[PDB]
Ligand binder design. Structure first.
Ligand SMILES: CCCCCCCCCC(=O)N(CCO)C[C@@H](O)[C@@H](O)[C@@H](O)[C@@H](O)CO
Ligand SMILES: CCCCCCCCCC(=O)N(CCO)C[C@@H](O)[C@@H](O)[C@@H](O)[C@@H](O)CO
Ligand SMILES: CCCCCCCCCC(=O)N(CCO)C[C@@H](O)[C@@H](O)[C@@H](O)[C@@H](O)CO
Ligand SMILES: CCCCCCCCCC(=O)N(CCO)C[C@@H](O)[C@@H](O)[C@@H](O)[C@@H](O)CO
Ligand code: NA
Ligand code: NA
Ligand code: NA
Lengths: 267, 267, 267, 267
C-alpha cells in the first residue's frame, strides 16, 4: 500500500537513523548517570523517566517497522529480531533467563551496532568468520580440558586454591595462557613443591599462545575480507571478483581466440 | 618573483633541511638537559638562552617560508600549519588551552617528523589509515562503555577503588584489557566476594583483546600500504597500479584483439 | 574380500565416526569426574568401569580397522599408529617411559583430533609448517643458550634463585621473554646490585620477542595455507593452483598463439 | 693454483661444515659446563683445555680459508670478517672495548649462525629488513624521548626512583610499553599523587604499542620475503619473479601480437 511505502521511506532515511541513534545515545547516557550512588531521589526519578521515554520511542520505531515490512518480513532479519528482543525484554517485569537476572539495561546500547550500517557490517564480518575457525577453537578447547584434568590431578592436593577442582584449574590455566603472573604468581610457587612442574606449564604456554594467536588471526583476516566485500556491496551493489576468477575469464578469452585462429583463420 | 624563487630553492634544499634538523636536535638536547635538578643557575640560564636561539632560528625559517610560498600557499599544508602553531605557541606568554597549561616545550621535537620527509610519510600513512578503522574503534568504545556501566553497578559498592564510579571502571577495564595483573590483582580478589565474576571478566577479555588486535592490525596493514605508495610517488612521481587494474587493462587488450580477429580478420 | 569391504564401509561412515566421537567424549567426561576428591568408593568404582567399557570399545574399533585395512595398510597412517599407541599403552600395567610414568589417561581425549577430519587437518597444517620455521626456532634456541650462560656468569652469585645455574637462568629468561614481572620482579632488583643490567635484559627482550613473534607468525601463515589446501583436496579431490602457475599457463597460451600468428598466419 | 683449489673444495664441503659445527657445539657445551661453581680445579682445567683445542681448530679453519680465497677475497664477506673477529678477539689478552670487558666467550656460539647457511639466511633477512623500518623506529625513538622528558618534569620530584632523571624515565617507560605492572606497579601509585596521570600514560601506551607492533610486523614481513628469495637463489640460482613483472611481460606479449594482427595481418 501507499501508506506502508511512505513509512518504509521514512524508516530507511538518514534522518530517521540519526534520531534513533541520538535516542540510543541519550538512553546510554541516562543509564551511565544512574550508576552514580550520590544522586538524589528526584534526580534518579528524572533519569528513570528519560529511560522510559527512550524505551517508548523504541516501541513506536519497532511497531512502525513491523507494519511497514510485515510480521514475516521484519523477523526475516536477525538484526530486527535482536532489536525486537532487546526492546521487548525491558517491557517484561518477571524475567526467567538461563543465568540469574537480566537487570543489565545498558545492553540496549548494543542497538548502536544494529542501527549504524558500518558498525553492523563490522559485527557481521566477525560473526561470519566464526565457522571457519571452529576447528582451531575446538583444538584449543581440547588442549584446555586435557591440561585442566592433568593440573587438577597433579597439583590439586598441594595447591587447592588454584587447582583444587576442574573449574579452578580451567580458570588458572586461562590466567596462565594470558601470561598474567604465570611465573612469579603461579609456577615458581608450584615448583617449590613440584620441581619439574615447568615440564607441564612451559609446553602448555607455548601450545596455547600459538593456538589462541592462530584463532585471533584467523578471525581478523577473514572478518576484514568479509566486511570489505559487504562495504563494496552496500555502495556499488556488487563486490570485487577474486584474482582467481579474473585469471579464469582471461584464460577463457585466450581459448576463444585460439579456436578462432587455428581453424577459423588458418584454413 | 626571482627573490621569492631563490628562497624557495634554499628552503627546498637538503642543506637547509639538515640545518633545521640539527637545530631541532639541539633544542631537544637542551630541554633534556634542563630536566636535571642538580644544575646550577648559570648552567640553567645558558641552556635557556640556547632554547631562545633555537626558537629564533625557527621564527626566521617559518617567516622565510611564509614569504616564499604566500600566506594562502603556506597554510595550504597541514605540516606547515603544525610547524607554525608549535613555534607561535612558544611566543605567547599567557596561554589558554582546553586542559591545564602547555608548558611541554619538548613537543617541538615533533618537528623532526614534519621536517624529515620519510618520517612525515610514516605519520601520514598512520593518520590516513584512521577513517578505515573508525567502525572497529567505535565497536571497542561501545563494548568499553557497556562493560564500565555493568562493572560499576555490579562491583562498585564492594570494590570502590576499582569500580566505585564510571571513570574508575573504565580505567580498570583498560588495565584488564592490557592483561596487567588482571587475575591476581583484580579478578581473584573480586571472585572472593562475587564467585561468578569470571563470567563477566573472561568474555570481556576475549572480546576486547580480539577487537583491539583487529584495530591495530587494520591500522598497520593500511598505514604500511599508504606509506609505500607515498614513498613511490615521492621518488618516481607515480605509484604501482593495483593488480586488479593491471588485469583490467590486460582484459581490454584481449577484447581489442578479439574484435580485430572475428570481424577485421575472419571476413 | 567382501566382508573386509563391508567393514571398511562401516568404519569410513559418518555414523561410526559419530559413535567413536561420543565414546571419546564419554571417556573424557568420566576422567574429568574422577578428578573430584569428594566422590564415594562406589561412585569412583562406577566411573572406572565406564573408563574400561570406553577402552574396550576402542580395542574393538582398532582391531576392526587392522583386519579391514591389513597390518601394513593400517600402520601406513601416522594417525592410526597414534590411535593404536594411545589405546595399547592403557592395556600395559608396568610402563617404562623416558620421563616418570604415563598415568595421564586424559591424553586419550587427543583422539578427538585424530577421529574428526577437520580437527585432524588443523593439526596436520601445524605439524607440516614446523620444518619451514626450523632455522628461526634454532636461532631462538641459540640466543637463549648464549643469554643463559651470560646470565649465570653475571648474576648467579648475587641472584642464585633466578640465575644460580644454567637451568635456573633458562627458566627466568623464558619468564623474561614472556614479559612476566620482568622489571618489577627481576630486572629492578638485579639493577639494585648491577646498575647496568638493563644493557643485558632490554636487548634480550627486544631480540627474543621479535624472533618468537617471527616463529609464531611463520607457523600460523604456513599452517593456515596448508590446512586450506588439505580442506580443498578433501572435498573436491584437488586444490587451487598457485597464482604463479596460473600466469605460467597464461603465458604458454600466448606463446602458442604467437607462433600460430607469425608463421602459420603471416605467410 | 691446484692446492688452493683442493682446499676450497675441502672448505666448501658438507663434511667440513659438519666438523666445524660439531666443534662450535663442543665449545658451547664446555663454556656451559664452566658456569657450574661446584666443579673441581682438575675438572675446570680439563674444560679450559677443551676450549683452547676448540679455539686452535678455529685458527686452522680461518687460516685455511684466508689462503684458499686470498686476503681481499676472504674479507670481502661480512660473515668471514665476523668469524675472523670472534676468533681473533680470544687470542688478545689485554682488551680495550667501548663498554667494560669482552669476557663473554660464549658469543663464539654465534658462529653456528655464520657456519649453517639456512641459519645465515634467517639473520641476513632480518638485517636487510632493518633500513625499511628505519623511519618507524625513528618515530618510536622520538615518542620515547618526548615522553621521557615530560615524565621526568611531571613525576621526577614525587616518584624519583621511577622518573627522577631521564635515564630512569626511559627505563620505566620501556617497562610501561611492555605493559609490565604498568597500572598496579606504576600508574595507580602515581595517580594517588597526580590524579590525571592516566591522561599521560594511557595515550603513551596506545601510541607505543601500535608503533612497536608496526616496527615488529614490518621487520618480520620483509625478513620473511628476503629469506624466502635467498633460499630460492641458494638452491636454483634464481628467485621467483614478482607478480607485477609477470603481468608486465604478459602485457608485452599482448602488444607484440596486437602489432602483428593490426598491420602485419589486416593488410
Ligand atoms: C577457555 C577458558 C575457560 C575458562 C573457564 C573458567 C572456569 C570457570 C569456573 C571458575 O572460574 N570458578 C568457579 C566458579 O564456580 C572460579 C574459581 O577459580 C573459584 O573456585 C575460586 O578459586 C575463586
Ligand atoms: C578506552 C579506554 C579509556 C580509558 C579511560 C580511563 C578513565 C579515565 C578516568 C580515570 O582514570 N580516573 C579518574 C580521574 O578523574 C582515575 C581513577 O582510577 C581514580 O578515581 C583513582 O582510582 C586513581
Ligand atoms: C626456550 C625456553 C626453555 C626453558 C627451559 C627451562 C629450564 C628448565 C629447568 C628449570 O626450570 N628448573 C630446573 C629443574 O631441575 C627449575 C628451576 O628454576 C629451579 O632450580 C628453581 O628455581 C625452582
Ligand atoms: C627505547 C627504550 C630505551 C630504554 C633505555 C633505558 C634507560 C637506560 C638507563 C637505565 O635504565 N638506568 C640508568 C643506569 O645508569 C637504570 C635506572 O632505572 C636506575 O637509575 C635505577 O632506577 C635502577
Ligand atoms: Na603481556
Ligand atoms: Na604482571
Ligand atoms: Na604482575
Amino acid at each position: 500500500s501507499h501508506m506502508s511505502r511512505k513509512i518504509r521511506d521514512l524508516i530507511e532515511s538518514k534522518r530517521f537513523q540519526n534520531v534513533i541513534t541520538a535516542i540510543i545515545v541519550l538512553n546510554g547516557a541516562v543509564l551511565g548517570l544512574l550508576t552514580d550512588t550520590t544522586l538524589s531521589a528526584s534526580s534518579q526519578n528524572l533519569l528513570e523517566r528519560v529511560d522510559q521515554l527512550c524505551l517508548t520511542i523504541f516501541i513506536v520505531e519497532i511497531s512502525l517497522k513491523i507494519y511497514a515490512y510485515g510480521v514475516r518480513g521484519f523477523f526475516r532479519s536477525g538484526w530486527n529480531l535482536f532489536d525486537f528482543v532487546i526492546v521487548a525484554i525491558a517491557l517484561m517485569p518477571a524475567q526467567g533467563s538461563l543465568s540469574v537476572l537480566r537487570t543489565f539495561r545498558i545492553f540496549r546500547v548494543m542497538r548502536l551496532v544494529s542501527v549504524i550500517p558500518t558498525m553492523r557490517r563490522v559485527v557481521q564480518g566477525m560473526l561470519l568468520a566464526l565457522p571457519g575457525v571452529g576447528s582451531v577453537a575446538a583444538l584449543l578447547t581440547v588442549v584446555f580440558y586435557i591440561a585442566a584434568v592433568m593440573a587438577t590431578n597433579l597439583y590439586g592436593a598441594t595447591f587447592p586454591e588454584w587447582f583444587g577442582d576442574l573449574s579452578k584449574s580451567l580458570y588458572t590455566l586461562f590466567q596462565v595462557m594470558t601470561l598474567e603472573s604465570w611465573s612469579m604468581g603461579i609456577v615458581r610457587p608450584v615448583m617449590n613443591v613440584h620441581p619439574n612442574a615447568w615440564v607441564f606449564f612451559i609446553p602448555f604456554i607455548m601450545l596455547t599462545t600459538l593456538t589462541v594467536l592462530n584463532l585471533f588471526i584467523g578471525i581478523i583476516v577473514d572478518a576484514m575480507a568479509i566486511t570489505k566485500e559487504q562495504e563494496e556491496e552496500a555502495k556499488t551493489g556488487h563486490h570485487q571478483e577474486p584474482i582467481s576468477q579474473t585469471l579464469l575469464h582471461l584464460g577463457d578469452r585466450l581459448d576463444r581466440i585460439e579456436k578462432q585462429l587455428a581453424q577459423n583463420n588458418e584454413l
